Amino acid sequence: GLPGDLFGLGIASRIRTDSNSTAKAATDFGQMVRAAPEAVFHPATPADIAALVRFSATSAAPFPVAPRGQGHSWRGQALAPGGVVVDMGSLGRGPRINVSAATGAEPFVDAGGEQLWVDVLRATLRHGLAPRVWTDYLRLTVGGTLSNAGIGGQAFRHGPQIANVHELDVVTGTGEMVTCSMDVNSDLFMAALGGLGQFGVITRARIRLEPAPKRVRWVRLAYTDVATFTKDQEFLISNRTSQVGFDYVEGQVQLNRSLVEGPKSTPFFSGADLARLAGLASRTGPTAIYYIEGAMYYTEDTAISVDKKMKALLDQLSFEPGFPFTKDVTFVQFLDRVREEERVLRSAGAWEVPHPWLNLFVPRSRILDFDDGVFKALLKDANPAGIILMYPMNKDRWDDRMTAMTPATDDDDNVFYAVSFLWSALSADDVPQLERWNKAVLDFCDRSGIECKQYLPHYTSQDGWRRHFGAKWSRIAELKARYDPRALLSPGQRIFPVP
Ligand SMILES: *Cc1cc2c(cc1C)nc1c(=O)[nH]c(=O)nc-1n2C[C@H](O)[C@H](O)[C@H](O)COP(=O)(O)OP(=O)(O)OC[C@H]1O[C@@H](n2cnc3c(N)ncnc32)[C@H](O)[C@@H]1O
Numbered sequence: 135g136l137p138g139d140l141f142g143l144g145i146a147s148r149i150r151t152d153s154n155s156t157a158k159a160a161t162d163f164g165q166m167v168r169a170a171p172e173a174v175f176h177p178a179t180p181a182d183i184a185a186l187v188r189f190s191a192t193s194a195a196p197f198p199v200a201p202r203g204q205g206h207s208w209r210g211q212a213l214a215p216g217g218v219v220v221d222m223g224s225l226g227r228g229p230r231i232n233v234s235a236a237t238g239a240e241p242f243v244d245a246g247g248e249q250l251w252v253d254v255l256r257a258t259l260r261h262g263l264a265p266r267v268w269t270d271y272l273r274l275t276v277g278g279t280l281s282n283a284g285i286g287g288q289a290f291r292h293g294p295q296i297a298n299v300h301e302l303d304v305v306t307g308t309g310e311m312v313t314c315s316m317d318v319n320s321d322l323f324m325a326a327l328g329g330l331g332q333f334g335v336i337t338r339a340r341i342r343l344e345p346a347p348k349r350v351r352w353v354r355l356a357y358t359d360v361a362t363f364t365k366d367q368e369f370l371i372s373n374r375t376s377q378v379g380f381d382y383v384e385g386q387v388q389l390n391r392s393l394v395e396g397p398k399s400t401p402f403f404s405g406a407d408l409a410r411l412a413g414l415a416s417r418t419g420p421t422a423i424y425y426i427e428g429a430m431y432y433t434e435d436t437a438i439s440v441d442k443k444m445k446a447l448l449d450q451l452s453f454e455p456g457f458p459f460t461k462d463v464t465f466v467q468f469l470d471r472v473r474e475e476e477r478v479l480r481s482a483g484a485w486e487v488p489h490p491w492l493n494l495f496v497p498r499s500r501i502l503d504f505d506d507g508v509f510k511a512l513l514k515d516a517n518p519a520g521i522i523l524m525y526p527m528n529k530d531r532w533d534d535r536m537t538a539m540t541p542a543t544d545d546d547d548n549v550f551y552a553v554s555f556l557w558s559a560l561s562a563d564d565v566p567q568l569e570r571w572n573k574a575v576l577d578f579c580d581r582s583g584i585e586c587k588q589y590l591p592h593y594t595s596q597d598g599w600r601r602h603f604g605a606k607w608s609r610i611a612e613l614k615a616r617y618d619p620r621a622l623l624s625p626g627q628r629i630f631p632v633p
């Protein structure tokens with residue numbers, strides 16, 4: 135398949151063509167798409183990626199090039215059949231994380247694009263520092279999350295991970311190594327952020343830092359009414375200047391059957407907790423439970439002072455009386471909380487299963503209409519494995535000049551919701567039902583005039599991508615022709631056909 139001259143290059147020592155090597159880059163976390171590449175490239179340095187890209191770009195027979203972080207995508211975005219998958223991890227040979235915390239200067243962290251957020255955290259904490267915004271799962275690459283947005287519970291305050299980047303090193307689709315920021319090569323900087331790897335491979339990111347907390351007072355608050363749940367979530371993300379508030383705000387939608395027929399205990403809830411919650415979800419018939427998940431960061435504060443601060447906050451809210459659930463953990467334990475969920479799922483053989491996940495950004499004015507059609511009609515009697523997340527964010531913390539898409543509204547509403555359908559197929563036979571629900575959610579939004587944006591979008595037609603990028607589409611097409619003229623990069627995204 136690949137050109138013969140590729141195996142004569144200085145970088146050919148980093149090309150792995152064996153069946154066991156290519157099999158490791160043939161599937162992703164979704165476990166639904168199988169597309170083996172011709173080879174896996176294990177670069178020692180970012181200049182090796184530049185050399186591979188340049189060779190393909192100047193070749194008589196250009197081949198697709200796809201970087202692979204942790205393969206934590208589910209629609210074949212990191213797959214390169216007929217081409218080369220770049221195992222980004224190989225760049226992590228030696229020291230790839232540098233913390234700059236010199237007195238009388240703004241602190242930052244330079245991290246390789248291949249570096250895991252868990253490893254960035256470990257390095258910065260040694261200096262009493264940490265990035266401000268986190269994904270829920272830390273075993274994701276810097277380059278992988280920055281090519282999307284990187285959303286989580288702190289984004290309402292500081293914006294997504296793409297709003298917390300000073301600069302990037304990018305290997306373009308021509309093989310050119312470019313350093314970019316708001317002040318130098320700003321077109322590539324804005325394009326790469328949420329750019330789905332279309333304009334180049336991120337090899338370095340300079341990440342914004344803030345003083346690190348030591349501990350976290352972590353709460354889950356139960357609601358039986360979607361209107362009260364959303365008013366409280368919006369209140370929690372709308373008083374950012376007040377000293378009485380959460381550093382992290384998320385939420386969860388638990389369908390009636392998921393509680394009643396669910397596990398005996400979870401890493402957060404005991405047996406007695408789940409028993410009371412099952413009782414609450416069935417007091418006047420079957421209802422879904424909506425949880426607000428809040429986290430309050432602290433450093434040297436005493437246990438009794440934290441109790442008083444949390445009480446002052448909870449005293450403002452309208453959750454079901456007697457239903458606050460509380461944990462007190464280290465900052466690392468809070469940020470790495472999903473690692474414990476993964477451990478439990480892997481023991482049960484419920485982790486390495488298909489994940490036909492769907493992530494939507496829903497306008498706040500339509501959130502109750504969305505709830506009615508999706509949770510109260512479509513899924514009222516459903517019992518999917520996995521979870522459903524729901525929480526609001528602030529548009530004023532997102533830079534709309536970056537590629538990443540958020541919902542557009544006629545009244546410029548600052549609030550939008552992230553609704554994440556993280557349902558798993560315990561058996562590969564459960565996939566068609568989950569995909570039918572995914573399509574039913576999207577069809578419902580279409581019929582109702584609810585103009586959503588998919589987060590981690592996946593379309594197989596240019597009509598889908600033009601609708602997704604909207605006003606930015608023409609600018610995106612222009613930047614693509616400039617930075618990846620041969621459309622070599624991350625073709626698994628399926629945005630651009632090969633010219
Ligand atoms: C599996 C998963 C994903 C996930 C999550 C929890 C789990 C269990 N929680 C998330 C969260 O709380 N917030 C959020 O914003 N995203 C969350 N995700 C999704 C995840 O961020 C993305 O899927 C992202 O792509 C990171 O994954 P990863 O490092 O594993 O990258 P990949 O799957 O291999 O590649 C995805 C696409 O990006 C391109 N890519 C990869 N690395 C680069 C670099 N360095 N530069 C440019 N493009 C890059 C791939 O080619 C592919 O198209």
Ligand SMILES: O=C(Nc1cc(Cl)cc(OC(F)(F)F)c1)Nc1ccccc1CCO
Pocket residue numbers: 270271285286384472475476479493520521523552554556590
């Ligand atoms: O995967 C996410 N969170 C998450 C949180 C928990 Cl407690 C468990 C979990 O399930 C599983 F199976 F253990 F991994 C996942 N989030 C996510 C995913 C994709 C895009 C955006 C997001 C941010 C939405 O908050």
